[PDB]
Amino acid sequence: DGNRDRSNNITDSLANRTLIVTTILEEPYVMYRKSDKPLYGNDRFEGYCL
Q1: Which residues touch 42 (CB under 8 Å, ≥6 apart)?
Q2: What's the rounded Cα separation, in Å, for the pair 45 and 33?
Q3: CA–CA distance, 40 with 50 (Å, rounded to integer)
Q4: How far is it, in rounded angstroms, from Cα 11 to Cα 8?
Q5: Cis link prior to 38 (omega < 30° from 0)?
């Protein structure tokens, strides 16, 4: 078998993986959001990278 060699418009396996990303603090790419409440989760930041 020479194989069918499938190519898909969207290449993801149902998106069942948590991407591991490391970041640093730099304007305007990364900063804390302006709030007076404690920050939690993945939304403690904002900027171009997010």
Answers
A1: none
A2: 6
A3: 15
A4: 6
A5: no
